Amino acid sequence: IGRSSVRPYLEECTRRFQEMFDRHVVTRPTKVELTDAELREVIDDCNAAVAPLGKTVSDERWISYVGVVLWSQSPRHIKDMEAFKAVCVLNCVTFVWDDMDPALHDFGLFLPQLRKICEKYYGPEDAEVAYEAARAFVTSDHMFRDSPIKAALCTTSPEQYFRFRVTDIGVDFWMKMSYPIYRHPEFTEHAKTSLAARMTTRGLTIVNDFYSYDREVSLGQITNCFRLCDVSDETAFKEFFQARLDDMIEDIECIKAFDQLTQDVFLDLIYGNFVWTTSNKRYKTAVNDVNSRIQA
């Protein structure tokens, strides 16, 4: 398995995902429109942050990354657009880190840039929280690139895999830098306990694992739950896919027990990510110029 694929299922599963969201979430996500200059403010900061790492990346590639933030926040409830712009920058620059050959990982060079982004957009205390989460994320991505721990958690069972993904997919980082956008106390506390990350991990990870399976197997990347099944076996795939859909539904139904603003945010993240993932260049083909490995 290195040239295995979920291509045959692409159509049916997208419809299965879509019908699950129509039944259980209902409310469609709405894309944040960035003005002319906000978009270039963001992209300018993004280049500045990765510039020390010595790899050019395109405005096309930036706008691929930033799409998840434009689509998966909660525009009904946004209050702080400076915090929003920060999440755009931080998520974009850590995507680059994610897509990057570990030889290009310079902490001494990159970590000061993360701190600068945070101090620019947040107040003193939010900046510290956003930075520790940024630091932990890029440190975790680097730590596990060939770790035996990653192999154990990703090959043992769904539970061990999703436990790894709370940090690795970046959703704990996302909550801890997104709470200042909303200035909602309940959500802020769920972000700080990581309950918010834990509630949304499977919904984000299952969707992303399906649509990025082809790219990741081609690159030898083993962090994908559908590697726990034989995708060439249609019966095994469909049974596994079904249990992953049950996981998403159970999570969503428990999310509805949270207060109204908080659950709106959780569901806009799960559903928004699905709209971005299924409409974006990054998940259209295994290898292209917005998702190719950034190497030596």
Known binding residues: 98, 208, 212, 216
Residue 208 interacts with which of a second copy, Mg ion, none, CB < 5 to 8 Å by class: Mg ion
Judge contact between 247 and 202, C-beta under 8 A: yes
Q: CB under 8 Å to 240, separation ≥6 — which residues?
A: 226, 228, 229
Q: Which residues are annotated as a binding site for Mg(2+)?
A: 98, 208, 212, 216
CB 233 to Mg ion: min, Å: 22
Mapped onto helix, strand or coil, the DSSP state of residue 286 is coil
CB 147 to a second copy: min, Å: 9
Judge contact between 277 and 211, C-beta under 8 A: yes
Comparison of 201 and 212: residue with beta carbon closer to Mg ion: 212
Judge contact between 275 and 204, C-beta under 8 A: no
Judged by CB under 8 A, the residue of 77, 163, 238, 281 near a second copy is 163
Select the span of 13-21, 206-214, 232-240, 247-255 touching a second copy (CB under 8 A): 247-255
String of DSSP letters for 208-245: HHHHHHHHHHHTT----GGGGS-TTSHHHHHHHHHHHH
Judged by CB under 5 A, the residue of 91, 201, 212, 263 near Mg ion is 212
Query: Is 208 near Mg ion (CB under 5 A)?
Result: yes
The residues facing 294 across adjacent strands are: 100
Judge contact between 98 and 119, C-beta under 8 A: no
Q: Which residues bind Mg ion (CB under 5 A)?
A: 98, 208, 212
Q: Which residues bind a second copy (CB under 8 A)?
A: 128, 132, 136, 139-140, 143, 148-149, 151-153, 156-157, 159-160, 163-164, 166-167, 172, 186, 189, 192-195, 198-199, 250-251, 253-254, 257-258
